[PDB]
Symmetry: C3
Subunit: 402 residues, 3 copies
């Protein structure tokens, strides 16, 4: 566990530097090695998505793809709704807040791109997913054609994407060799920057939020995994490279390459499931963001002395799940969509309003909460993949046996 | 003809909704299914162009490509010039109007500065130039004496060949949804502009649509019979692209289905239809030229300054010249119509009522965009069969009952 | 030498037209045939880079790639530093000037792209180089795998890039058939436009700068080439297509396709060296830009009567080499980065001081100096490739024997 050692050592180094006022030295000396690690992984996000979906979709019939697609969507929505429920529980238990819209139809239509090459250039995950899935379905239909020229043309096209997919998986393994320094550098800069703001009432928010994410892993991804027969301890131990990487990169879409490599080289999941459930889940399944939004909504409301009612806590659950899909896999994306959650309950943010000062207080520790959010936003993607794969008999039983 | 049934049923539904003031309900309930249909076809425009040109150009020698290229350009210019002539005839008969980019730089823009940027920016002409020479280079490498170069070129062509067949397969799947997309698209357009066609604007719509109907049956029915191609079979076979262009209102948008129809219903070799269709989708728009001819007289007659006989000839050259300028996007004919009006001297100013007549046309621009795109792709199909017949690339079995 | 004949004939035609005031006719009649030539070559820059690096890197083991990479960087920095030294010598000898910042760490991090498809769309050479090199390294590792499916998938992926590379090399040969008209048109317009501004003190700058570039070729690329055994006369004669093309296109990145074709079809250099040293050198190795900056810094200083001291001439050398990497392979890129060189020595540019007046005077003949700059910015890339190839035994001895 050398990678995990860097996270603990870097946090101590960041706290020591932050307490001694050495944040400036770390920002211009250590961080540049953390930024290189983020850029290396963010580079492989697009090639590993276009290649994996085409090979993954072409390896299974469209009938099984529909069953797998519907199955994971129910899990994604149920876990996201459960995550918001946990957020209200931990927020009320800790009593946070003591002192002191995009079109839904247009968002669905945006799944279908107007230019597949522009979506790759613009770094859009969902439009690429739609184009690559139907490309894989079209490829596997051409391989069943009676003509020999069409069959060989489709095989050559798939081999290019198959060779591209294996190339990216190989590069990720090389990149993670540098992760022992990238993880150490990333956590050191974040700890040094925000090692002081967590002093008073903001500390209760961090404690309440992090308690919810910890409970979410061991009550939602430990009970459901045991129901379907997957060992929870093995799942957490195997998926520690993506959990640590998401805990430093703070971008679920950013830590997509390593999540794909871990899900297939450590869990034995077929390419027809993990290649589809991971990128789609990286854009629509973020339980940590939903749980964080639940706590902060109560924190903002309790700061201005207008706590949510029992009925008001139910409408905010639906919006939090709805806003969860809206958030992208980029750092600091949960605070932007948190405004829509606050406006849903009626707490509009006005330039000098009290609800616009509690919002600024959250943004002070937004990065320290972004770390916990991304840690579980990819764990749910992995946990759902094993659950769906177990029901589809695509799990490799040898990989889960000591 | 289930697809054609949706167009007629949707028009009735749109007229009923528009007359009862239910345009708001259609815009937020029905249009979203039409927008999905447009996005599905617009997605396949770029992959179906890059893959088809490479395979199409590599399947024939460059000598035949030059003969085919020159042959269709003469047809494209002759039909466009004829289309403007029809527009003046129908405009004068109906008595409508009762109540600049560098040319050299445009030609230089055909050669891209970055092939990947052209694909990302959705440019058809720069992609055409790069893909044609890529296909020519590929077919030259396959004739090399070295074995490694020959296999490398074959693998590169098979990737584009597999990509081309994949897009053609996806189009067939998309057109299964066209029974709902066409119905939704025509319903929203009819509901939105079912009231503005009431008075003098109705005469413009009648005069313009008469010209496009006459253009199909006098230009694409006489020339097709001269070269031996049956006109009735051509119209019946190319009804999927005609209907799709009549709802999408974007010739570049309805390029995928036009390619699939031209090869799975007409038996045209990939070396002709893959080249003549995208190039024609950017430079051959007879409906736009015919529409511009009628509206120029309508604008002039509205302000009481009719064009003279000499003034009607200079406006013909500009209309053909402005026809190439228009892109395959909705509402692109009105933007370039300003250049046609300024050519004859009718500059648009906020003070003069010249801009007032221009604004009146924009009110029914979408209802005229539907007829324009309907023939802008028919001419691309009609020219392809004419060129293919002269090149003996037409499949005679596909044109025999 | 028909191509070289057009350059001489076009210069005479441009001078005659410029002297008679016929620059307007040439700009709207002749230049458009030169612009077509530039667009044709600029189109092939990206496909010839992505395809060549992948095939070049996969053809050799990563151990040899590191040795070649380090070897050429030392040559690139040594020649660039030598070029600035020559600029001060010719500038002081001619006595020019008689009358009258981007982050370094961020620039290095920008080598690793965040989206490989966006880098291709945005026309970035260095980010594409990094992605294509590791893609080639990953491909050659997959071909050594024990599995048969992975081996065939990697071979198919390489054959696509191999077929793409040979296609671009074939297109360049076709484009250079038109170069007899493109070179004539390009040089005619430039000569006609700036055939009058070279009259007085600006003529001394052109003479001093062009003397330095001529001396650089015959003292730096003629002594070092003879040391390693490569004939200097054969190198210049063979690499005359790229030298002339760079002398009209005025963009080293623009004249990358022909430089690649000349380096492999006339010098017998393996694809693992020239495909890597040329595009990297087209962005970081510009000796002509460095030599031009050295002369103009003294010219600007001497114009305002504040000549550089002996110590001040050494700090300006380091910045000129540092600013040399900053310049891109586009026309007029040396004047933009020349401001940083002037500010390094203390000569900040202000509208009031005549420092900007001397800078504006240089911009008047910037294009006539851009021609000489690009002529040697690609010669150094070619000269370094043969030197590195000779040490790696990848040079074809048959191509260098009459
Ligand atoms: N940065 C988080 C989203 C958030 O800000 O909540 C992620 O990528 O998962
Ligand atoms: N939208 C039309 C052009 C026009 O507006 O006339 C087309 O794509 O063909
Ligand atoms: N245009 C030159 C750079 C410069 O302006 O000095 C080149 O591409 O090499």
């Amino acid at each position: 566990w050398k990678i995990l050692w860097g996270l603990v050592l870097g946090a101590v180094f960041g706290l020591i530097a932050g307490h001694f006022g050495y944040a400036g030295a770390v920002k211009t000396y250590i961080k540049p090695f953390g930024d290189l690690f983020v850029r290396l992984l963010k580079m492989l996000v697009m090639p590993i998505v276009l290649a994996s979906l085409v090979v993954g979709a072409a390896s299974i019939s469209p009938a099984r793809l529909g069953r797998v697609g519907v199955k994971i969507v129910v899990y994604y929505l149920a876990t996201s709704a459960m995550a918001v429920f946990f957020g209200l529980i931990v927020g009320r238990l800790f009593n946070v807040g003591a002192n002191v819209p995009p079109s839904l139809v247009q968002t669905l239509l945006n799944i279908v791109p107007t230019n597949p090459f522009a979506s790759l250039a613009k770094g859009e995950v969902l439009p690429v997913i739609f184009f690559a899935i139907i490309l894989g379905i079209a490829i596997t239909y051409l391989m069943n054609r009676n003509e020999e020229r069409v069959r060989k043309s489709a095989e050559t096209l798939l081999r290019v994407f198959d060779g591209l997919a294996e190339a990216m998986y190989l590069i990720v393994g090389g990149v993670m060799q540098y992760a022992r320094i990238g993880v150490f550098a990333l956590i050191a800069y974040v700890m040094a920057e925000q090692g002081v703001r967590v002093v008073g009432p903001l500390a209760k928010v961090v404690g309440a939020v992090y308690t919810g994410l910890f409970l979410q892993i061991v009550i939602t991804y430990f009970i459901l995994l045991k129901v379907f027969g997957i060992d929870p301890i093995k799942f957490i131990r195997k998926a520690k490279d993506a959990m640590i990487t998401a805990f430093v990169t703070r971008s679920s879409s950013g830590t997509l390459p390593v999540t794909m490599r871990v899900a297939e080289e450590e869990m034995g999941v077929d390419k027809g499931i993990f290649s589809f459930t991971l990128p789609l889940g990286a854009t629509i399944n973020m339980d940590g963001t939903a749980l964080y939004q639940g706590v902060t909504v109560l924190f903002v409301a309790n700061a201005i002395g207008h706590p949510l009612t029992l009925g008001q806590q139910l409408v905010v659950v639906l919006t939090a799940v709805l806003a969860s899909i809206g958030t992208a896999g980029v750092p600091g994306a949960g605070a932007i969509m948190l405004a829509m959650v606050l406006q849903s309950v009626g707490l509009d943010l006005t330039p000098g309003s009290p609800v616009a000062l509690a919002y600024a207080m959250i943004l002070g520790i937004d990065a320290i909460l972004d770390m916990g959010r991304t840690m579980v936003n990819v764990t749910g993607d992995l946990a759902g993949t094993v659950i769906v794969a177990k029901t589809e008999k695509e799990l490799d039983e040898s990989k889960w046996i000591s």
